[PDB]
Amino acid sequence: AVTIRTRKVISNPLLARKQFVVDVLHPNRANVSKDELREKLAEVYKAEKDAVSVFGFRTQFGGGK
Amino acid sequence: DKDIIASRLKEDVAEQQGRVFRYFGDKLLISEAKQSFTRVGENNLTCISCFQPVLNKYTFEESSNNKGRLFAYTVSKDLQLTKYDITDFSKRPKKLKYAKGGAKYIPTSKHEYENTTEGHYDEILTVAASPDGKYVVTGGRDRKLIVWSTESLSPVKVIPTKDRRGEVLSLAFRKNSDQLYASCADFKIRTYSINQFSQLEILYGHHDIVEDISALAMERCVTVGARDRTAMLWKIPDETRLTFRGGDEPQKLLRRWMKEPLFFCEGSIDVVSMVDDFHFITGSDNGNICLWSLAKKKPIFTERIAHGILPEPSFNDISGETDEELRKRQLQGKKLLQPFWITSLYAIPYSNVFISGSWSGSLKVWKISDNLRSFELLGELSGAKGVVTKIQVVESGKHGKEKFRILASIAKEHRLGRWIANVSGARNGIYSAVIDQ
Amino acid sequence: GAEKKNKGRISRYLANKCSMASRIDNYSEEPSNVFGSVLKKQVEQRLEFY
Amino acid sequence: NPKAFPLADAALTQQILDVVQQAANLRQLKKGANEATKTLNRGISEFIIMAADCEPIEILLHLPLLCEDKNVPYVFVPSRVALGRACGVSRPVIAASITTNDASAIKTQIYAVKDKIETLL
Amino acid sequence: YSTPKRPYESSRLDAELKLAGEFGLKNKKEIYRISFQLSKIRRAARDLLTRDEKDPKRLFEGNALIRRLVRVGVLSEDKKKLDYVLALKVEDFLERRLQTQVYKLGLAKSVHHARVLITQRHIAVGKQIVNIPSFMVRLDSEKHIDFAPTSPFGGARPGRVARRNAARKAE
RNA sequence: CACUAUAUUGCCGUUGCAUUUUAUGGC
């Protein structure tokens, strides 16, 4: 079972936008399915899957995170 | 009035602030507790995990499922966990339910991850009962861990550590949650979600067998490994750690004494608890009790040999000579005296008080100072003749008036090895002290 | 000839018990008998499984 | 000079016990009195450790007469249960011996420990 | 990499043969790589010796250099002086690489089996799976080496041959 | 949850009932 964490949560009301570096830990899955992880991220935040957006991913060497 | 405002702040906002607030050091009389022993004949009991239902869990809707009674769970070394009612204070803990493990719980694949068999191979080590009271996890030297139901004790699920040598050595629940930090002796700390019945993350970076773990409300873990004289504090949500080492050498302690008396070096850190999210205490192999913060590496306050020194052997079983002068000289004075290296330690969370236990026959209670840089005695609890595997404290009373029940599991050998030095009349049982005001 | 399965493992028990007893009464400069007595009690309690 | 003479102090006791633990985890340590004297007269023994509170003391005091004959160093420590916990085993050992091995990863720590105990004697 | 001055000596050929043999190497280029970094590390160590004692350049950069070499582990902490860096040599450098280090740690039973199970991505140093032999494990991470979590020698699923043969034995 | 309702300790030594009670020390 995966666990998505966030870090360096800095707000930015210049775009009314809360930006951060997200890191997912999937111990045995291949990848975390951008749509599925962004809707889980919207769930752990206030709301709006359509208004959350995560874009800069890369899976580190050896898998897992 | 102002007192009701203060009581509403001390309801929860102090504990979410995460500093030591529940001050009852001098408020607590000690020397007249109701110090009842209970004998249970199941062959070196090794753990105690009590569970009290917390009322109105940070909103309302009092607790989770009876309605409002406490519990305790305990673990043998011959593969038997037992569920005790403890709720009736000034009464003995009554045995309720039982679960054993035999040889038939050995699988037949035997060479992979699958330890799907529900009971236990051998040598169950320690338990932890979940704060929502649905499950109790158990785990021992058979590289599994089990979720038992808290009512019929039925193997809900079995979680293998998936390792050649991942013996589970101590479990801890993050309070008011069901995340579980298990401390596996292949130098690693595992995290599990009980309601998801899965493994969140495994976290490395230690250096020897991570033999004790503790946790509190926020996402901290404080673990100690044995033969590396260190203590790791894990902060999960940024994924980093903090390494607090020892560093008390006997020649420098002699420099601190020589202004105007025996003490010795540090074998191994053994036990931990954390008094808040900002200080924790450990107990070592030289009896030393360390009080430690977040900000410093050295000990803030290290109490010396805590439970005293073990008695030297006699004339009669040291050399086998006939003359008492030579069998006196074979004792070598005090030079081969070794301390009562402590075996369990517990701090009530956010409290002025903690307790320590070894096989000196007696629990020792300690009170931190107000400025949080020193601590001292409070008394002595002598009915626990034997080795103390684990202490847990359960409470009752009003917002200010307290009624405590200390539950110390007592065996006649240490919960990992065998390692006795003539333990004198240790009944396997539970020490249970009612202490009030 | 000496040291009089169920006899084999008790022969091994008696063997390392008497080697230990030999170490005791050799290197002790003026030996006592009490450790020999407790070794005797140990080995008789051991063979009392039969 | 009572009977178990080269008895280590606290710091040297602790460093020889931690090198004992990593040797036992590397499977370079043979434990117990008769396995110790067996590897002593096999000839693969780097140095030997003996717990000087055993019941009684002569059961391992047979070992100096072999070890100082065959020129390997020997130390006493103050506690059998300390040596047992440091060997990583459930019962209290009283004697322990590091087998010589050039494929070890602990070789420099072994040699530093050996130099300290040889200057102790 | 760096080529030698006179590479075709029989002495240097027997040198490369012995080092590659008892440390499990793949050609002479590995020897030349770590010999080049050894050469630059003691050529930077000797001029600090030739300059004056307690020149703060010498003091600070010598303590920097030996603080690096103690942490890599080629210099034991009993010899914390700069001329021991001059006394250092190349077998101490290829003793600390991950292949030889895991073979000394056990779990590999031969140096080339150590190299090949490193390259099968089986061995992780603490957290990170490493699939290169020439790694130079530091003295802290010496005792962090065990099999990967996602490896059949660790605690993962049995491998391809194992489950294929288990299926054919189910047939 | 609602029912149906079925009517101190593994061994060894103990205070004490108007059967429980009760805290000690041997494996």
Curated annotation (Swiss-Prot), chain A:
Coiled coil: none annotated. N-terminally acetylated by acetyltransferase NatA. Also partially acetylated by NatC. There is a cross-link at K18 (Glycyl lysine isopeptide (Lys-Gly) (interchain with G-Cter in ubiquitin)). Transmembrane segments: none annotated. It is found in: Cytoplasm. Belongs to the eukaryotic ribosomal protein eS24 family. Component of the small ribosomal subunit (SSU). Mature yeast ribosomes consist of a small (40S) and a large (60S) subunit. The 40S small subunit contains 1 molecule of ribosomal RNA (18S rRNA) and 33 different proteins (encoded by 57 genes). The large 60S subunit contains 3 rRNA molecules (25S, 5.8S and 5S rRNA) and 46 different proteins (encoded by 81 genes). Component of the ribosome, a large ribonucleoprotein complex responsible for the synthesis of proteins in the cell. The small ribosomal subunit (SSU) binds messenger RNAs (mRNAs) and translates the encoded message by selecting cognate aminoacyl-transfer RNA (tRNA) molecules. The large subunit (LSU) contains the ribosomal catalytic site termed the peptidyl transferase center (PTC), which catalyzes the formation of peptide bonds, thereby polymerizing the amino acids delivered by tRNAs into a polypeptide chain. There are 2 genes for eS24 in yeast. This is Small ribosomal subunit protein eS24A.
UniProtKB/Swiss-Prot annotation, chain B:
One of its GO terms (biological process) is maturation of SSU-rRNA. One of its GO terms (molecular function) is U3 snoRNA binding. WD repeats lie at residues 119-158, 163-202, 205-244, 264-302, 338-376, 383-429. It comes from the Eukaryota. Keywords: Acetylation, Coiled coil, Nucleus, Phosphoprotein, Repeat, Ribonucleoprotein, Ribosome biogenesis, rRNA processing, WD repeat. One of its GO terms (cellular component) is nucleolus. It is found in: Nucleus, Nucleolus. Its main location: nucleus. The WD domains are required for nucleolar localization and U3 small nucleolar RNAs binding. Interacts with UTP25. Component of the ribosomal small subunit (SSU) processome composed of at least 40 protein subunits and snoRNA U3. Belongs to the WD repeat RRP9 family. Involved in nucleolar processing of pre-18S ribosomal RNA. Required for efficient pre-rRNA cleavage at sites A0, A1 and A2, and biosynthesis of 18S rRNA. Present with 5130 molecules/cell in log phase SD medium. This is Ribosomal RNA-processing protein 9. The chain holds residues 113 to 570 of 573 of the full protein.
Curated annotation (Swiss-Prot), chain C:
It comes from the Eukaryota. It is found in: Nucleus, Nucleolus. Interacts with NOP1 and NOP58. Component of the ribosomal small subunit (SSU) processome composed of at least 40 protein subunits and snoRNA U3. Belongs to the NOP5/NOP56 family. Required for 60S ribosomal subunit synthesis. Present with 13500 molecules/cell in log phase SD medium. This is Nucleolar protein 56. It comes from Saccharomyces cerevisiae (strain ATCC 204508 / S288c). The gene is NOP56. The chain holds residues 337 to 415 of 504 of the full protein.
From Swiss-Prot, chain E:
One of its GO terms (biological process) is translation. There is a cross-link at K169 (Glycyl lysine isopeptide (Lys-Gly) (interchain with G-Cter in ubiquitin)). It is found in: Cytoplasm; Nucleus, Nucleolus. Keywords: Cytoplasm, Isopeptide bond, Nucleus, Phosphoprotein, Ribonucleoprotein, Ribosomal protein, Ribosome biogenesis, RNA-binding, rRNA processing, rRNA-binding, Ubl conjugation. GO terms for cellular component: 90S preribosome; cytoplasm; cytosol; cytosolic small ribosomal subunit; nucleolus; nucleoplasm; small-subunit processome. Residues 96-170 form the S4 RNA-binding domain. Component of the small ribosomal subunit (SSU). Mature yeast ribosomes consist of a small (40S) and a large (60S) subunit. The 40S small subunit contains 1 molecule of ribosomal RNA (18S rRNA) and 33 different proteins (encoded by 57 genes). The large 60S subunit contains 3 rRNA molecules (25S, 5.8S and 5S rRNA) and 46 different proteins (encoded by 81 genes). Interacts with snoRNA U3. uS11 interacts with MPP10. Component of the ribosomal small subunit (SSU) processome composed of at least 40 protein subunits and snoRNA U3. Belongs to the universal ribosomal protein uS4 family. This is Small ribosomal subunit protein uS4A. It comes from Saccharomyces cerevisiae (strain ATCC 204508 / S288c) (Baker's yeast). The lineage of its organism: Eukaryota, Fungi, Dikarya, Ascomycota, Saccharomycotina. The gene is RPS9A.
